[PDB]
Amino acid sequence: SKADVERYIASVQGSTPSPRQKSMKGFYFAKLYYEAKEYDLAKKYICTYINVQERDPKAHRFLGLLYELEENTDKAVECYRRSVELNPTQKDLVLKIAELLCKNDVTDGRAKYWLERAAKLFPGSPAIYKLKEQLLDCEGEDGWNKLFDLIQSELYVRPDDVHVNIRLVEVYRSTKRLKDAVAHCHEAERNIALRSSLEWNSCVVQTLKEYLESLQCLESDKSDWRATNTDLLLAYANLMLLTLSTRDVQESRELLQSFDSALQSVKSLGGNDELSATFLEMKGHFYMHAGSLLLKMGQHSSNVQWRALSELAALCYLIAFQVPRPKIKLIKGEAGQNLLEMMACDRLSQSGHMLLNLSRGKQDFLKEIVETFANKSGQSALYDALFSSQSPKDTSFLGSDDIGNIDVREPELEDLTRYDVGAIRAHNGSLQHLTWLGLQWNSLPALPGIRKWLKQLFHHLPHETSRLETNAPESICILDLEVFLLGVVYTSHLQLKEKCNSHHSSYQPLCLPLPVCKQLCTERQKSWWDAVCTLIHRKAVPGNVAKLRLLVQHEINTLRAQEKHGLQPALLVHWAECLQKTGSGLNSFYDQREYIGRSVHYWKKVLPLLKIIKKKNSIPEPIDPLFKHFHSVDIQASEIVEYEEDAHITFAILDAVNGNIEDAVTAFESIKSVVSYWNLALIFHRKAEDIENDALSPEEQEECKNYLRKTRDYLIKIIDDSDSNLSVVKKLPVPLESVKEMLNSVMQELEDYSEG
């Protein structure tokens, strides 16, 4: 407090004899008064130091900062100016003089002169762009010319996302340079860091309208009007994606009703040009965004029945699936990934996965939708829910559409497997999109195509890394990214389960649409993913490379289950299970051995943690964890039997996949699970396939028949245990009927071997 600074300065001015030695402590005395907010006592003690040390730039800078905290602009500037005179290395203080002059007087030739000096010390600086902008808007018509040349010449360096591109388009539109405004949009839209802004897309959509509102009946304009409507419908579809994701329900209505109005003006152009092609695809995006708006209404509308919103949303996704994918001929020169192919695959992925999240666990569900709503009553119920009955249906795209020519076909999973491989190109490997697809596939019995997606996004990586107890970015493989995404999906799925453990409805989807599903992954999971992407694709900005490396080198300890990893036991089981089920699902010894190798790595990290819980000890949680612990999956004291069975089964599977067959047989015959019996049957059937039947000895033929007998007599045990206990069928990795398909074969393979 003041009184402690006063007591210290009293005893320190007692322990000082001469006046000049008291002044020589004045800098120190002044800082202590400033740290009590005693600003005039700070001023009084720094001036009584300066009057004994006229040439310290730090004492002058401290007196300037005290005048800045007294709003005394030119005295702050004069003490800063004097500090620049006494040490010219202070580039920062040259810029701080330009701040406090342009914030005092915009006409001041000193403001313009100190900005001149700041620019000549920091080119490419948004703080210096902003201090020029503030002078040149005040230089009038003579200002406007200089402001145009400034905007062009400092855009050409790429600071400043969003702002300067909107301010340029304002200045074109106010001067009625409308084709110049649209031509700037035609260049600026090539920047992905503008296409992500709601503000930019709002300006683009409104600039394209104001240009159409200036075109005429001329045969030039019959081409300009085509481009500008293709641009306008694509800009509406991206603005609608952003508005669904970032704004309210009513903000989403008024935009969708504006997009409906812009489809209705193009709808007359029955033809075969790229506006005819864009219009067809944009019917698909309109109904996808309308189905997204109905489920976004359900997310907030506390008094509304989820059936009516999800029925009208299922109709919307059925239309948004059945809109045919563009039949492009992409040409042998154009390295441009076609936008209509990527947007059609993102549509067919999102509408297809949303149909399967709404039909889930029902019968005739898409037929409830078609027989009730694929008609002009359903067309009204859809319009009167989306827009309300305040506008005409005759003047609307939706209100005058067809929705009667509809198919009843559910989305085929191999078609989705090919549309995700387009959607992930549109989303550039975004973790929110990869987690969203992961949760849709985690609603099905088949595994997500993560290996397809990762070898598409990171094709310069090895699949495994022979250095698992290391954390360097130079040792990353696909399996660290596969494990990472499996953990982001798992921790997102449990944080959906535990929301649905309240008031969930059979007409509410378990996963909401991508433009409606709030953030799934943590900013730490994302900060690792975005840093991995930025390092591998070498987008790493200078200096920041070191921060990105240190962050990436933090979570590789976590992911590979290294020293003090802090993971939940059930997440390490889920990683072992998913890699085991993926490894055996591949026609490749090298892939099997890498996948099952990484599964066995996690099982050999699980067995120690189980041997904490089997004593009724807890495990230490991280205060911030990369993957959350969840008490709705914390391992119970009984399950520590099965998580000590399946671990050794997975060792015997890896060691069979090593060629360690007699170790693996000994392991399986010691474990005596039905999963062990199935791997014994496969090992002994393979030991009849590895006998080349072109004139064998009777000794080789009788060991072959003894392998077929060992196979038969282990396939039988799987029937014995399964009709003795109908739970055992749920550890079996195949249909019980395919145990009988193989057993019938292995009996024919023994009885045909007996008529000679």
Binding site: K31, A540, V541, P542, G543
Partner: protein, 147 residues
């Protein structure tokens, strides 16, 4: 004809295969490898000039090539320090709202100065640089001094 003018003919590929190994996110690793390439050829040329009979006028180019690549080596060393500091400072300057302690010693005023002051920090990187040149000219020799 000079050996030095024949021996340094690789460095135009060697710098290229070093550039095509790196990126804008490994742009200092590139200059540290450029110093290792120049320092390797300075080592080779020194291991030729130290074997020339004094006054054999052919080795004039070998000695000029040694000094040229020795001054190049330390100019890559200079670049690898000063442009690292200047990029780190330009990424930290939004953050450092420091406060001095009432009870600080000379050491901890200077521990604060070398954070506060890029002119003092870059001036010491020139001292460290110039002291490293004199160090590399001393090498193994300290224990060969008869008194």
């Amino acid at each position: 004809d000079d050996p030095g003018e024949a021996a340094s003919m690789s460095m135009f590929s060697d710098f290229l295969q070093s550039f095509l190994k790196h990126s804008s996110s490994t742009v200092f690793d590139l200059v540290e490898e450029y110093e290792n390439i120049c320092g390797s050829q300075v080592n080779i040329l020194s291991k030729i000039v130290s074997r020339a009979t004094p006054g054999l006028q052919k080795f004039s180019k070998t000695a000029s090539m040694l000094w040229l690549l020795q001054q190049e080596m330390v100019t890559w060393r200079l670049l690898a320090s000063l442009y690292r500091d200047r990029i780190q400072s330009a990424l930290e300057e939004e953050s450092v709202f420091a406060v001095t302690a009432v009870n600080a010693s000379e050491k901890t005023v200077v521990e604060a100065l070398f954070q506060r002051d890029s002119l003092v920090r870059q001036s010491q990187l020139v001292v460290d640089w110039l002291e490293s040149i004199a160090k590399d000219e001393i090498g193994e020799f300290s224990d060969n001094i008869e008194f």
